[PDB]
Design a protein around this ligand. Structure first.
Ligand SMILES: Nc1ncnc2c1ncn2[C@@H]1O[C@H](COP(=O)(O)OP(=O)(O)OP(=O)(O)O)[C@@H](O)[C@H]1O
Ligand SMILES: Nc1ncnc2c1ncn2[C@@H]1O[C@H](COP(=O)(O)OP(=O)(O)OP(=O)(O)O)[C@@H](O)[C@H]1O
Ligand SMILES: Nc1ncnc2c1ncn2[C@@H]1O[C@H](COP(=O)(O)OP(=O)(O)OP(=O)(O)O)[C@@H](O)[C@H]1O
Ligand SMILES: Nc1ncnc2c1ncn2[C@@H]1O[C@H](COP(=O)(O)OP(=O)(O)O)[C@@H](O)[C@H]1O
Ligand SMILES: [Mg+2]
Ligand SMILES: [Mg+2]
Lengths: 297, 104, 316, 254, 345, 318, 257
């Protein structure tokens, strides 16, 4: 059994306004660990009572037709049933448009409470046709205490700074540190979870590699850039991770405003190219060439 | 029209510089191959090749296309009869030749 | 009630078709000689392909047109079985005709049937060609399979020149005695985009809406991003005056036009805008890239602003 | 112009239904002697002979012999619309493209008319030699149909053994094999009198799929005729009351 | 059992020659219960297949090595060939074209149903192995992750890909990443020496270094090249003429031709060379990378950055487009223009 | 209770707003029987479907309305064209006389071959059947198909002609609304009446009061003050502190980079930049907005936007 | 608390199956005067009206009017579970939540009961007006089904022309042309086979044969069917139920060229 589902849980207020409706379509977003599904399940249980159960929902035609089969059915009488469709952002744009159409001609009997990662889900039901709700992620301190408790109960040998590193590599959301810790303790056998094990599990590039990349860029010899990029690719590090880490480094250094601007713009172009599936090695070579050209002046 | 009227009747109506009609007859006599194939650019008279070969050898001719629904069961119906059945005629015309068109 | 002008003044003979003159003459020659081969018609919509095919069939078959002609459209079922059952049995159907006449099968919107349907149609075309001929019509010639085009006389049609459009429209005006003005004629021609059907429909709608035909009424009923304003848009882009171009773009956007309409009309204006050929090609390529971005979902006003900026920077 | 009339219209429906499976495109040889049909498959596996004598029909008028191609499926769909007691009248012109056939109820105040379209089919028929078959078998049509139906399940091929004492029907397949033997009867009933004329014992094998098609003529006559020789394709003939005959030809297996 | 590449491939995790720490971690993971889905990735010729085979060897018995040819069909129908064993199935679904999603779904259904048929002598699940996951389409990857959630209890998935750039985050968010770096020069030297020694031969250190650096840290390349130079001449010398694949030489000659003369006729000749390259089904990205690598050997230091940026930009355009030659030709033309401008100024 | 979008949907021709010329033209066509096939297109939620329903109900009483008007939606799908549509168009009326009517909502969703089939059906029975095609994008319509019908463009609702309609809802649904709350309700609606009603109902449900800050928080749209602060930070603060401030604000209020980028676009055109600087900024912001669509990392794009602005500072000062 | 006991339950099955092919769901306008159904075609071309008078039931106990709406297909499917000689009794609660279907064996203790899930439908009264028709045809139901199914092979449309002497059914299609002439029954003792034709002026209308094939499904209900038709009015097909009611059908004529 995964530990994420074992311990997955602030926003109990929104349940009251749902029960006050005695109904715009609900849209719940935010980091996945914010307990949105648990929140909507509890709200449905409170509103409809134990004796009334409800459907939960990968294809689009099948989903929409199933919506017709359910919503077409009458109810004992409470008047409106609210449809879930979690993982809404995973749906394709055409699927989301068809789901938007399915939202109409069924609002007279059923309603919808979509769950997704925010802006990734398309516009026309996002704008109007839905009552949006944001679920704030837990504070870093509270997450640190929670992971400390998880380590203590699951007798995981990890230090507090290890917990801080783990919650850092799980930027802005929970249940990623939890599964990272579970994978780490199962790979290590529970003997010890060092920070480098977490670095390898999360795919983070060691900071020494970034320092070497910057040193090669500062050197001013293209051969060193070629060698270091070849070595970095040979290590198997994803180019997106290198772009992200080097972006985080650059934005808070003491480089000039012009240099920082040029490097960040090149980083954005490289990230866009990598999004389209361009070759990692060529993009990294170009980015490092730009970094040289900025740092060699 | 004209093409049928001036279509080849015997082996004497073949044209020169053709290596197909001059070498298909050796295989289609009774060295033990099962199926044939068509290759090369068009315009070589490959459609009338087997017909003329059968006419010269006295064998019968059968030809099909995609004009009928090409279900596998329909394939069995069209081909098993044409292969495994003799002819309702004199013994001379009993052997048959088969052609499949528009395989794709 | 009265028929729509697109049908009330549909040409009934090949003599009154203002399309591609050489192809029309070739069709007349085929009608006279009789033994027409299988013909395929491709080109822009509404240039007269359907009218030409119907007139050819009527001339060839005459009184026998009722039972010697089979017509299928996208409104009918043209599935894999229909071509195997209706088309094949009709081809086998016995019809007595004069020596130069053949049974004509007309498949308008020929680009619409699937690959399998056309593959099946191949042999039926080939076998019964001694007594049956096919008259295909489509907008995109690439959609019909290569063997079909190989065993047919492909007849290209083109967008009709503005002179032909003007002649047909003036003939209709004389028929209807509709008041007009040169600006209205230019506007209706511009809205036509070489399409007789579009031109006649727009002219009839304009006359119904307002009677007298002028540019103002034409653009009122045929609402679109006004070509003049787009002309000042592109002119400002040439002069690198980004601010004025944005002013026009923001006015158009506040008018509520969708970005797709704005970009299409911009490109259409870039057709005939008098300006350097190399720079015009640069503008066309940039507009094409922006239209890529628009068509794939990114249709914000910011995209049109970026288009204006890049056009300004093309001239440096 | 041709015209004919058949009081017992059920005959036309039955002959038509039994023939439509074998042949979908057949040409009809209208003659003063009567109606003659002979259609032959493209693979030349089998031949069917249909002859309706002119005097068989209640009335008949063939001004001159004329051929006219006919789709069998279209006729089967048309003829099903006629009741079994209906009287069928056929009509055509010298070279008309349409066949005019009329279904008349037995004076039951109902007249049904149809005008079928014809094909461009002009395959001129080829004659078939007559031969005195080595073995001739006459035996009930229903029994033969049942034998073909049963053996078809076991295998696609049937072995026919001809002997003076009795005929033998044999087939083999993956599920096994089975044999059926019909001894020469002692004049039982008279349609049940399985009669065998055996000049020389003969062995041949045939595809059962075609034989299953041949059995669809069973409603025409309670009795069927089987005759074959070593080199002669099998003949299966149904006597159509007195209208004429319907003869089935099938080539043997290699 | 003839070629050195397969003959000396280790069977178990414990007998690995490099990344032994990762081998120990994998052994601990397989030893403890609740085996999760794996996402193994790294450069080609690093040992991902070897590592996965050793993971299977530890997870099941030695019978996993007894692979069997399997052929399966899917509805639309498409027939594909697969490789399986009596505990696992291996398939590259990307070879089925854009119909990869349906074949993934059907194969997972079949494996899930079959595992319940007393395929539980050691583990309560089968292993579905997918190679070149990066070549899968986005909808195919969505179906993959959905089915992985669907049948987690009855089967496990192991994914192998050269890079994780084309893998959707939802798949990466639910699989355990196993990074397998390309072995260092020294590691390749030892494994080459170990193969050389166990075969009864002698590999000088300088030759091992030349092989390692020339192999570009691809162990399969190193082993092939070592065996080739052995069969060419057993008495290895420091100046051994180590051979290399023809297409690399052809690409190098193409780059030399580009450098030699910046004229449109030479441009057409280079286009013919590019047709020859693409004909042999070498990926366009490989051609671009090799062309850039050899070009930089001739360009001046002040010119290399522009060439690298141009190469990256044109490769990205090629990825967006469909006609590979268009963008490769454009990059070649742009390089010739720039090099002509700089040499002549 | 019942959501206000249909609870206050227009029911007669008088309830419609800002389209009085279009309504007058359609009324004239109806009265004079010259009603042609209708192509209505515009931004979503401007009352096209309600307009055509009002016209039909004016022409047809509810007793025969069901038997003489076939309302359909295209997204419910070619069989629709050859099935119910063809069957309805291929017969005359049941009870009344005159032309029938077919309303095809979301017509732009049909494929091109389906549009050709619909065009053939329409031309075949233009005498006794009239088609109303409703779509958002005119460009999605086959040019041959749109050459059979008159095109009407339903523009977005201007504020002063849509404010009174909201005021009626406020008087009906007792919710206190401030002047700035009303102005923000109009601004976020952007001419969309359905959007305005949905935002109003969601705001009332969330807090029971309608105010600019309340509605902006409810919809998540960034405030003008926030955009001004972001612009000031990029133009003045150095790169590190500007990035920190923008990231902090974005994560605090849950802003989306798309809305942010649109608002700075508007401000850039509002402020008086030098021409070349404005061109550079527009090119950049367009490039960033393109990058967001494919699904890139948002932090890098935000820093790229800052970079695009940070370059101009030295250029602008000089 | 609706209650309606029907001795001859097999009728209800025939009523439902005659509608399931044409109408998927309908509202039963249940009143103390009887049960009435009036549902209109999905493609809006045709229309069907149904009336079940209260006096025909064994016992009718509709205390208050109901507007009950069910699924015709689902209701029919349960009806096949009822024997042709079983007493069928329908029952609804004080509110129309679920439908109680009671099947009682005529002479044995076996009793079966079923409950149906209901439907919410927005329907309106449709203005079916009573007019005299220029042509009224009363012919055997089996004969009408025969004619409709025969010409269905010919083509999808049938031309119906009537005269004083008889009625002519004409059709044309891809496989040929055919027409059936049915003259008025001169003298037959009983109408069950007699074709009675009453007409004022000659009429000629064309109808789609797909629907007419749908319409013929009600033939088992009654031995005879009455066809009412006039110029520019939809065809009216009515089946007279035995002392119970009628099943009236309506179909708009196809367009002439
Ligand atoms: N050797 C030949 N002798 C006489 N006529 C020939 C010869 N070869 C070809 N022809 C003629 O050339 C024409 C080609 O006919 P046919 O259909 O056999 O050609 P094909 O090459 O098989 O077809 P395709 O070009 O369509 O692939 C016919 O008119 C045929 O009579
Ligand atoms: N050359 C022409 N001269 C006069 N009128 C024309 C001409 N071409 C088209 N038209 C008008 O346009 C109408 C539509 O033409 P038609 O149906 O033949 O179009 P088409 O080119 O076949 O296009 P599509 O297949 O897209 O419908 C005609 O009925 C006629 O009124
Ligand atoms: N002009 C208007 N006057 C009053 N209310 C309006 C108007 N336009 C839209 N609405 C409101 O918005 C709702 C949605 O309108 P409707 O769906 O008919 O618009 P539409 O422009 O045809 O859009 P769509 O294509 O998205 O359906 C209406 O029910 C009504 O409450
Ligand atoms: N530890 C090792 N010892 C010896 N040979 C190895 C070792 N690891 C890998 N190899 C060899 O290197 C080759 C790499 O092949 P493969 O696993 O396909 O690489 P990848 O999967 O990383 O592309 C294998 O054929 C194997 O023989
Ligand atoms: Mg046309
Ligand atoms: Mg609407």
């Amino acid at each position: 059994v995964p530990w994420v589902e074992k311990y997955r849980p602030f926003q109990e207020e929104v349940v009251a306004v749902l029960k006050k409706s005695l109904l715009p379509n609900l849209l719940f977003y935010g980091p996945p660990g914010t307990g949105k599904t648990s929140t909507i399940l509890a709200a449905a249980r409170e509103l409809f009572g134990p004796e009334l159960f409800r459907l939960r929902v990968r294809g689009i035609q099948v989903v929409r037709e199933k919506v017709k089969n359910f919503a077409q059915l009458t109810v004992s009488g409470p008047p409106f049933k609210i449809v879930i469709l979690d993982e809404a952002d995973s749906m394709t744009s055409a699927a989301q448009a068809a789901l938007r159409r399915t939202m109409e001609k069924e609002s007279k009997t059923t309603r919808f409470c979509l769950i997704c990662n925010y802006v990734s889900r398309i516009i026309e039901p996002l704008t109007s046709r839905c009552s949006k709700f944001r679920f704030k992620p837990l504070s870093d301190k509270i997450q640190q205490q929670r992971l400390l408790d998880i380590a203590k109960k699951e007798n995981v040998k990890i230090s507090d700074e290890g917990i801080a590193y783990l919650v850092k590599v799980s930027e802005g959301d929970l249940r990623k540190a939890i599964t990272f810790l579970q994978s780490a303790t199962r790979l290590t056998g529970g003997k010890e979870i060092t920070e480098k094990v977490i670095t390898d599990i999360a795919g983070v590039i060691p900071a020494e590699k970034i320092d070497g990349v910057f040193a090669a860029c500062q050197s001013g010899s293209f051969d060193k850039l070629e060698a270091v990029v070849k070595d970095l690719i040979d290590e198997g590090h994803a180019a997106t991770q290198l772009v992200n880490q080097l972006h985080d480094v650059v934005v808070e250094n003491n480089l000039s405003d012009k240099q920082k601007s040029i490097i960040t713009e090149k980083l954005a172009e490289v990230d866009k190219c990598l999004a389209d599936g361009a070759d990692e090695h060529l993009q990294l070579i170009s980015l490092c060439a730009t970094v040289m050209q900025q740092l060699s002046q | 029209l004209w093409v049928d009227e001036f279509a080849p009747r015997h082996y004497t109506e073949l044209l020169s510089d053709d290596f197909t009609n001059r070498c298909l007859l050796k295989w289609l006599k009774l060295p033990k191959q099962k199926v044939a194939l068509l290759c090369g650019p068009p315009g070589l008279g490959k459609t009338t090749l087997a017909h003329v070969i059968a006419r010269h050898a006295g064998y019968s001719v059968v030809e099909m296309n995609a004009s009928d629904d090409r279900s596998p069961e329909v394939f069995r119906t069209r081909i098993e009869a044409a292969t495994q059945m003799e002819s309702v005629l004199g013994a001379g015309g009993k052997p048959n030749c088969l052609v499949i068109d528009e395989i794709d | 009630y009265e028929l729509p002008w697109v049908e009330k003044y549909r040409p009934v003979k090949l003599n009154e078709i203002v399309g591609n003159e050489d192809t029309v003459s070739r069709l007349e020659v085929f009608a006279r000689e009789g033994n027409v081969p299988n013909i395929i018609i491709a080109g822009p919509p509404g240039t007269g392909k359907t009218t030409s095919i119907l007139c050819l069939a009527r001339a060839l078959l005459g009184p026998a047109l009722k039972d010697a002609m089979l017509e299928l459209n996208a409104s009918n079922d043209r599935g894999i079985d229909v071509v195997r059952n209706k088309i094949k049995m009709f081809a086998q159907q016995k019809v007595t005709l004069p020596k130069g006449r053949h049974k004509i099968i007309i498949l308008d919107e020929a680009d619409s049937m699937t690959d399998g349907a056309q593959q099946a149609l191949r042999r039926t075309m080939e076998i019964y060609s001694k007594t049956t001929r096919f008259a295909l019509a489509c907008n995109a010639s690439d959609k019909i399979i290569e063997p079909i085009q190989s065993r047919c006389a492909v007849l290209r049609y083109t967008k009709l020149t503005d002179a032909q459009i003007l002649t047909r429209l003036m003939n209709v005006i004389e028929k209807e005695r509709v008041p007009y003005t040169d600006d209205g004629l230019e506007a209706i021609i511009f809205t036509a985009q070489g399409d007789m059907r579009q031109a006649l429909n727009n002219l009839q709608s304009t006359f119904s809406g307002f009677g007298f035909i002028n540019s103002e009424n034409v653009f009122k009923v045929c609402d679109e991003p006004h070509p003049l304003l787009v002309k000042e848009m592109i002119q400002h882009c040439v002069n690198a005056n980004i601010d004025e171009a944005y002013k026009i773009l923001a006015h158009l956007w506040h008018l509520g036009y969708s970005p797709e309409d704005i970009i299409g009309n911009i490109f259409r204006v870039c057709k005939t805008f008098q300006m350097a050929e190399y720079l015009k090609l640069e503008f066309i390529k940039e507009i094409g890239y922006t239209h890529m971005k628009i068509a794939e979902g990114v249709n914000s006003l910011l995209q049109m602003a970026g288009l204006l900026a890049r056009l300004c920077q093309k001239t440096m | 112009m041709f015209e004919a009339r058949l009081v017992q219209g059920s005959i036309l429906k039955k002959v038509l239904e039994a023939l439509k499976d074998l042949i979908n495109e057949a040409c009809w040889d209208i003659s003063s002697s009567g109606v003659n049909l002979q259609s032959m498959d493209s693979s030349h596996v089998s031949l069917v002979q249909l002859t309706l004598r002119s005097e068989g029909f209640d009335t008949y008028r063939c001004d001159r012999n004329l051929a006219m191609g006919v789709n069998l499926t279209s006729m089967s769909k048309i003829l099903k619309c006629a009741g079994n007691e209906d009287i069928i009248t056929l009509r055509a012109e010298d070279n008309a493209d349409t066949l005019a056939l009329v279904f008349e109820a037995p004076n039951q105040e109902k007249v049904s008319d149809y005008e079928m379209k014809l094909m461009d089919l002009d395959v001129e028929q080829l004659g078939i030699p007559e031969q005195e078959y080595s073995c001739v078998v006459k035996m009930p049509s229903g029994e033969f149909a049942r034998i073909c139906r049963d053996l078809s399940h076991i295998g696609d091929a049937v072995v026919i053994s001809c002997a003076k004492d009795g005929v033998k029907f044999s087939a083999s397949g993956e599920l096994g094999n089975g044999n059926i033997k019909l001894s020469q009867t002692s004049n039982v009933d008279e349609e049940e009198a399985v009669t065998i004329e055996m000049n020389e014992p003969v062995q041949l094998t045939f595809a059962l799929r075609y034989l299953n098609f041949f059995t669809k003529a069973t409603p025409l006559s309670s009795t069927v005729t089987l005759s074959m020789s070593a080199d002669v394709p099998l003949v299966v003939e149904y006597k159509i009351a007195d209208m004429g005959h319907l003869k089935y030809y099938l080539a043997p297996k290699i | 059992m003839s070629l050195w590449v397969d003959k000396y491939r280790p069977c178990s995790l414990g007998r690995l020659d490099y990344h032994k720490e990762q081998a120990a971690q994998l052994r601990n993971l397989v030893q403890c219960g609740d085996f999760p889905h794996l996402l193994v990735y790294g450069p080609s010729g690093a040992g991902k297949k070897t590592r996965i085979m050793c993971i299977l060897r530890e997870l099941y018995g030695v019978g996993v090595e007894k692979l069997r040819i399997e052929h399966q069909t899917i509805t639309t129908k498409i027939e594909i060939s697969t490789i399986a064993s009596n505990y696992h199935l291996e398939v590259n679904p990307s070879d089925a074209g854009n119909s990869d999603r349906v074949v993934i779904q059907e194969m997972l259904k079949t494996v899930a149903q079959s595992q319940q048929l007393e395929t539980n002598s050691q583990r309560d699940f089968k292993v579905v192995l997918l190679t070149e996951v990066d070549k899968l389409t986005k909808d195919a990857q969505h179906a993959l992750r959905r089915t992985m959630e669907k049948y987690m209890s009855t089967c496990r998935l192991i994914l192998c890909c050269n890079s994780t750039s084309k893998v959707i985050p939802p798949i990466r968010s639910r699989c355990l990443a196993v990074r397998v770096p390309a072995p260092s020069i020294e590691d390749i030297c030892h494994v080459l020496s170990t193969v050389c020694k166990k075969e009864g031969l002698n590999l000088p250190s300088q030759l091992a270094h030349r092989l390692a650096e020339k192999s570009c840290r691809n162990l399969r390349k190193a082993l092939l090249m070592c065996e080739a130079c052995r069969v060419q001449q057993y008495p290895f010398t420091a100046d051994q003429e180590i051979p290399e694949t023809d297409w690399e030489v052809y690409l190098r000659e193409t780059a030399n031709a580009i450098v030699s003369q910046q004229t449109p006729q030479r441009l057409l000749e280079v286009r013919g060379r590019l047709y020859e390259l693409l004909t042999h089904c070498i990926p366009p990205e490989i051609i671009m990378k090799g062309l850039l690598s050899e070009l930089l050997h001739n360009c001046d230091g002040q010119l290399k950055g522009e060439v690298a940026q141009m190469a990256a930009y044109y490769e990205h355009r090629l990825q967006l487009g469909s006609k590979a030659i268009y963008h490769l030709e454009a990059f070649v033309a742009k390089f010739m223009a720039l090099y002509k401008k700089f040499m002549e100024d | 209770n019942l959501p206000w979008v249909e609870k206050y949907r227009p029911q007669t021709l008088n309830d419609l707003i800002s389209h009085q010329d279009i309504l007058s033209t359609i009324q004239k066509f109806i009265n004079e029987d010259r009603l042609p096939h209708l192509l209505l297109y515009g931004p979503p939620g401007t009352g096209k479907t309600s307009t055509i329903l009002a016209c039909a109900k004016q022409l047809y009483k509810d007793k025969e309305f069901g038997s003489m008007v076939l309302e359909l939606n295209a997204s419910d799908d070619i069989d629709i064209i050859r099935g119910p549509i063809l069957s309805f168009a291929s017969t005359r009326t049941i009870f009344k006389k005159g032309f029938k009517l077919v309303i095809l909502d979301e017509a732009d969703a049909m494929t091109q071959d389906a549009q050709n089939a619909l065009r053939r059906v329409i031309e075949k029975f233009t005498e006794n059947t009239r088609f109303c095609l409703i779509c958002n994008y005119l460009s999605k319509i086959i040019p041959a198909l749109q050459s059979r019908c008159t095109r009407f463009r339903f523009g977005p609702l201007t504020p002063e002609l849509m404010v009174p309609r909201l005021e009626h809802v406020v008087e009906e649904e007792k919710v206190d609304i401030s002047e700035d709350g009303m102005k923000a309700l109009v601004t976020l609606s952007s001419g969309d009446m359905r959007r305005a009603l949905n935002i109003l109902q969601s705001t009332n449900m969330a807090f029971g009061k309608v105010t600019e800050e309340t509605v902006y928080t409810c919809t998540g749209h960034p405030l003008k003050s926030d955009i001004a602060n972001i612009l000031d930070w990029m133009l003045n603060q150095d790169f590190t502190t500007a990035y920190r401030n923008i990231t902090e604000l974005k994560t605090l209020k849950g802003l989306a980079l798309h809305d942010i980028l649109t608002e700075i676009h508007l401000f850039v055109h509002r402020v008086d930049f030098p021409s070349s600087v404005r061109i550079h900024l527009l090119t950049k912001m367009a490039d960033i907005e393109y990058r967001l669509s494919v699904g890139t990392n948002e932090k890098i794009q935000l820093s790229s936007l800052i970079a695009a602005f940070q370059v101009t500072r030295d250029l602008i000062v000089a």
